[PDB]
Structures are given as structure tokens and as C-alpha cells.
Design an enzyme around this catalytic site. Structure first.
Site, mmCIF file in Angstrom:
data_model
loop_
_atom_site.group_PDB
_atom_site.id
_atom_site.type_symbol
_atom_site.label_atom_id
_atom_site.label_comp_id
_atom_site.label_asym_id
_atom_site.label_seq_id
_atom_site.Cartn_x
_atom_site.Cartn_y
_atom_site.Cartn_z
ATOM 1 N N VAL A 27 0.799 -1.226 0.000
ATOM 2 C CA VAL A 27 0.000 0.000 0.000
ATOM 3 C C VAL A 27 0.835 1.282 0.000
ATOM 4 O O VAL A 27 0.275 2.377 0.000
ATOM 5 C CB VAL A 27 -0.983 0.064 1.197
ATOM 6 C CG1 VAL A 27 -2.150 -0.901 1.003
ATOM 7 C CG2 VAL A 27 -0.243 -0.192 2.501
ATOM 8 N N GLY A 28 2.162 1.147 0.006
ATOM 9 C CA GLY A 28 3.068 2.305 -0.022
ATOM 10 C C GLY A 28 4.517 1.980 0.326
ATOM 11 O O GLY A 28 4.828 0.873 0.792
ATOM 12 N N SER A 29 5.400 2.954 0.094
ATOM 13 C CA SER A 29 6.838 2.832 0.338
ATOM 14 C C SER A 29 7.481 4.231 0.314
ATOM 15 O O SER A 29 6.930 5.157 -0.285
ATOM 16 C CB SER A 29 7.494 1.921 -0.718
ATOM 17 O OG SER A 29 7.293 2.420 -2.041
ATOM 18 N N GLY A 30 8.637 4.357 0.978
ATOM 19 C CA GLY A 30 9.483 5.570 1.012
ATOM 20 C C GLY A 30 10.899 5.132 1.394
ATOM 21 O O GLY A 30 11.197 3.936 1.373
ATOM 22 N N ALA A 31 11.783 6.063 1.758
ATOM 23 C CA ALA A 31 13.142 5.676 2.165
ATOM 24 C C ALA A 31 13.233 5.151 3.621
ATOM 25 O O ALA A 31 14.298 4.644 4.040
ATOM 26 C CB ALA A 31 14.128 6.833 1.939
ATOM 27 N N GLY A 33 10.818 2.936 5.039
ATOM 28 C CA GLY A 33 10.348 1.548 4.995
ATOM 29 C C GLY A 33 9.124 1.404 4.115
ATOM 30 O O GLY A 33 8.574 2.404 3.624
ATOM 31 N N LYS A 50 4.662 -2.695 8.737
ATOM 32 C CA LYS A 50 5.730 -1.870 8.157
ATOM 33 C C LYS A 50 7.038 -2.623 8.279
ATOM 34 O O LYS A 50 7.378 -3.173 9.371
ATOM 35 C CB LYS A 50 5.870 -0.545 8.885
ATOM 36 C CG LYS A 50 6.981 0.288 8.375
ATOM 37 C CD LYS A 50 7.021 1.599 9.087
ATOM 38 C CE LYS A 50 7.698 2.646 8.264
ATOM 39 N NZ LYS A 50 8.493 3.625 9.105
ATOM 40 N N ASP A 164 3.094 8.744 13.028
ATOM 41 C CA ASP A 164 4.480 9.116 12.842
ATOM 42 C C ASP A 164 4.588 9.671 11.406
ATOM 43 O O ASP A 164 5.551 10.363 11.066
ATOM 44 C CB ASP A 164 5.392 7.892 13.072
ATOM 45 C CG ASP A 164 5.080 6.693 12.087
ATOM 46 O OD1 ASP A 164 3.892 6.527 11.701
ATOM 47 O OD2 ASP A 164 6.028 5.922 11.727
HETATM 48 N N1 LIG Z 1 2.721 9.621 7.988
HETATM 49 C C1 LIG Z 1 2.398 8.372 7.689
HETATM 50 C C2 LIG Z 1 1.659 8.094 6.530
HETATM 51 C C3 LIG Z 1 1.329 6.758 6.245
HETATM 52 C C4 LIG Z 1 1.729 5.707 7.112
HETATM 53 C C5 LIG Z 1 1.415 4.351 6.856
HETATM 54 N N2 LIG Z 1 0.726 4.048 5.734
HETATM 55 C C6 LIG Z 1 -0.044 2.825 5.476
HETATM 56 C C7 LIG Z 1 -1.551 3.116 5.597
HETATM 57 C C8 LIG Z 1 -1.854 3.504 7.036
HETATM 58 C C9 LIG Z 1 -2.181 4.824 7.334
HETATM 59 C C10 LIG Z 1 -2.431 5.144 8.663
HETATM 60 C C11 LIG Z 1 -2.348 4.179 9.678
HETATM 61 C C12 LIG Z 1 -2.016 2.867 9.368
HETATM 62 C C13 LIG Z 1 -1.775 2.530 8.038
HETATM 63 N N3 LIG Z 1 1.823 3.399 7.724
HETATM 64 C C14 LIG Z 1 2.540 3.732 8.813
HETATM 65 C C15 LIG Z 1 2.919 2.758 9.734
HETATM 66 C C16 LIG Z 1 2.467 1.444 9.584
HETATM 67 C C17 LIG Z 1 2.786 0.449 10.515
HETATM 68 C C18 LIG Z 1 3.538 0.830 11.624
HETATM 69 C C19 LIG Z 1 3.978 2.148 11.788
HETATM 70 C C20 LIG Z 1 3.662 3.118 10.855
HETATM 71 N N4 LIG Z 1 2.808 5.024 9.085
HETATM 72 C C21 LIG Z 1 2.441 6.010 8.271
HETATM 73 C C22 LIG Z 1 2.782 7.334 8.552
#
Ligand SMILES: Nc1ccc2c(NCCc3ccccc3)nc(-c3ccccc3)nc2c1
Ligand SMILES: Nc1ccc2c(NCCc3ccccc3)nc(-c3ccccc3)nc2c1
Length: 336
Positions: A27-31, A33, A50, A164
């Protein structure tokens, strides 16, 4: 009771996870993780897993990994992202290479509603939740520092989580000016910017760079008083400010026209240039704008957060080990 893992490659990357998590959908990626959506068979909830990219590449990276693990493990509040699980495929420190964080899946971020302009009532609830989240985090002596719509997750229930679109747009001016001693209220500034965007549909301070960012901010808030300059330690900072063409404060009522007067008054109290006068999360919660939500019994503070590690210069393997310990000592939160 050690679990059983299975492997799989998704978009150039190996994921080894516990059978408990099934149907991994990238569902997504960056530098920092990448993340997959998954079904947690243990809780029947949709989660995000993640996988940290390169967690122990350098001392900077290893100390970043340990800090991310520590913050997430600490966050235990409805309006802040929390940690359902953390794991590693490694059976010992010596083979410990990979870090996976698990968290509730969220419907969308705050842009996926912003881009549209919300009703006043939605604004109340959204900003309520952010402040309620901020009070918690601030109580723990932690500053977010990067609040912006893309870092706010929102359901279809309008339930909001702090997780985060340029960061700079939402940065408190004193961060833009490079002050080393900014308080928690740098986040309140960002809330102010996000709040104003939910009311008008437009980025309040959409500057092309830092200089421009300052120009736009000052156009609304006015050039600093006697009392503020009185408190700037930095000679060049002080002279830049005086250097500039004295802008008068705008009357917020004349800017966010049509907006709810109680909204305009909170903005007045949030977007003050002098961060010493700026309203706090706790105080903002008690503002009348959130009359229909405020409950001082249900706005909890946090356990103290041990930040002493930030001051520690350690080796990669040491950060690695500390992280390893935080992986092992994780206790899953009590179920639904
Ligand atoms: N600024 C952000 C933007 C998007 C993120 C993202 N995206 C996946 C969809 C999601 C969105 C909102 C909540 C869950 C999932 N996943 C995670 C994350 C996942 C697992 C553990 C720690 C951090 N952090 C994100 C921080
Ligand atoms: N008690 C305070 C309260 C607020 C402060 C503040 N905030 C406004 C920054 C700014 C004002 C006007 C236009 C653009 C930005 N900045 C600084 C500061 C900044 C740089 C270097 C050293 C110190 N100190 C502050 C001490």
C-alpha cells in the site's frame, strides 16, 4: 511460544512474517520503509505491517530505528497511532537484521478529505481529536514537530489518529528561523495551520521556500512587537526581523470570513508569533469551540517517556541490541 513465519516477495522486497498475518497487500513505500495491508487472523482486524528499510545501516539509522520503536511502544491513546505488534524473523541478536511494526489500518489521511472543505462540525471533531492526541504526547515531553494533513489518519467514522503537501507550510516560524529552544507549542502552530485549511479549503501558508514561508506568515500575523524582539537571543535573527517591512496584524475575522467566530478566536490563540503566549493543547481543549466534545475526565495524559538515550553516542551494534531488547520486551495491548 515462538511463531511460524512464511516468506514472499513484494515489489523487490522479501517479507518474512508470522502466519497470523495473511493477505499482504502493498500500500506504499518511502526511504524509511514499506508497508503492506494484512488480515490479522488473531484479532480479525485489518492491519498495516511496516518493514523498516535498512534499519541498521549506520549509527544514524540504527538510532532512528530504536527511537521509532521506543515512541511507538510508548503511545497508548485513542488519538495517537499505537503498536499492535512488533516482530523480527531473527531467532537471536546475532541474526537480527529486520524490524517489522504492526498497527491498525487506517482508512485515509487528512488530505483524502481536504482536497472539498469540511463542515464546521467536522472541523470541531477533527481538531478536537488532534489536540486530545497532542495533550497526551506533550504530557510525555515529546514534541511531534511535523504535524500536517498527511500525518493525520482519519476513518469514515471521523475518528482521527496522529501518525508518525510540503512540511514547511505547517512549520512554526521559530523552527523556520532555526531557534534551538522551541517548546511543544510548535505543534499548536501546525494545528492552527491545519485547522485553517479545513475551514477555508486552502493552505494558509503555502510558501515556495523558507523566506517566502515567513513572508506569508507575517502577512497574517504581523511583524513582532517590542516584547517579542526583547526575547530573541540571536543578533542576525533580530536584525532580519527589523530589516523587514513592518506588517500589521490582520484581524482574523476579516480573513476567515464566513467562519465560525469561535473558530476564529481559537485560531487567534494558536497562530500567535510569540510561542510563549501561544495556547497549549490542554488549554485549547477547554476552549468553547469544543463545547460539544470537551471532557476533562476523558483527556488522559501519558506515562513519562525516557528520552535519555537521545543524548547517548553509541555504536551501531549497541543501538541494534537496544532495539533487539525493545523488540523482545513488547507486550501486545489487551484485545477488543
Ligand atoms: N505519515 C504516515 C503516513 C502513512 C503511514 C502508513 N501508511 C499505510 C496506511 C496507514 C495509514 C495510517 C495508519 C495505518 C496505516 N503506515 C505507517 C505505519 C504502519 C505500521 C507501523 C507504523 C507506521 N505510518 C504512516 C505514517
Ligand atoms: N521567547 C521566545 C519566543 C519566541 C521566539 C521566537 N519565535 C518567533 C520567531 C520569528 C519571529 C518573527 C519573524 C519570524 C520568526 N524565535 C526566537 C529565536 C529565533 C531565531 C534565533 C533565536 C531565537 N526566539 C524566541 C524566544
Amino acid at each position: 511460544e515462538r511463531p511460524t513465519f512464511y516468506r514472499q516477495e513484494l515489489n523487490k522486497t522479501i517479507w518474512e512474517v508470522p502466519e497470523r498475518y495473511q493477505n499482504l497487500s502493498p500500500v506504499g513505500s518511502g526511504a524509511y520503509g514499506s508497508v503492506c495491508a494484512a488480515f490479522d487472523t488473531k484479532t480479525g482486524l485489518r492491519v498495516a505491517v511496516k518493514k523498516l528499510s535498512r534499519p541498521f545501516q549506520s549509527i544514524i539509522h540504527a538510532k532512528r530505528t530504536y527511537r521509532e520503536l521506543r515512541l511507538l511502544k510508548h503511545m497508548k491513546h485513542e488519538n495517537v497511532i499505537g503498536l499492535l505488534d512488533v516482530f523480527t524473523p531473527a531467532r537471536s541478536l546475532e541474526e537480527f537484521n529486520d524490524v517489522y511494526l504492526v498497527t491498525h489500518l487506517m482508512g485515509a489521511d487528512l488530505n483524502n478529505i481536504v482536497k472539498q472543505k469540511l463542515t464546521d462540525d467536522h472541523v470541531q471533531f477533527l481538531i478536537y481529536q488532534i489536540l486530545r492526541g497532542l495533550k497526551y504526547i506533550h504530557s510525555a515531553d515529546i514534541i511531534h514537530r511535523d504535524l500536517k494533513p498527511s500525518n493525520l489518519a482519519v476513518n469514515e467514522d471521523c475518528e482521527l489518529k496522529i501518525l508518525d503537501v510540503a512540511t514547511r507550510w505547517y512549520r512554526a516560524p521559530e523552527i523556520m528561523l532555526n531557534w534551538m529552544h522551541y517548546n511543544q507549542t510548535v505543534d499548536i502552530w501546525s494545528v492552527g495551520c491545519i485547522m485553517a485549511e479545513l475551514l477555508t479549503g486552502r493552505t494558509l501558508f503555502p510558501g515556495t521556500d523558507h523566506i517566502d514561508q515567513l513572508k506569508l506568515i507575517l502577512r497574517l500575523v504581523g511583524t513582532p512587537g517590542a516584547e517579542l524582539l526583547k526575547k530573541i537571543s540571536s543578533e542576525s535573527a533580530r536584525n532580519y526581523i527589523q530589516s523587514l517591512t513592518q506588517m500589521p496584524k490582520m484581524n482574523f475575522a476579516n480573513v476567515f470570513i464566513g467562519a465560525n467566530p469561535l473558530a476564529v478566536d481559537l485560531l487567534e490563540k494558536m497562530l500567535v508569533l510569540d510561542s510563549d503566549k501561544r495556547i497549549t493543547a490542554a488549554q485549547a481543549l477547554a476552549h468553547a469551540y469544543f463545547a460539544q466534545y470537551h471532557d476533562p475526565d476523558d483527556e488522559p495524559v501519558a506515562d513519562p517517556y525516557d528520552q535519555s538515550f537521545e543524548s547517548r553516542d553509541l555504536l551501531i551494534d549497541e543501538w541494534k541490541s537496544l532495539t533487539y531488547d525493545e523488540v523482545i520486551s513488547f507486550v501486545p495491548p489487551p484485545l477488543d
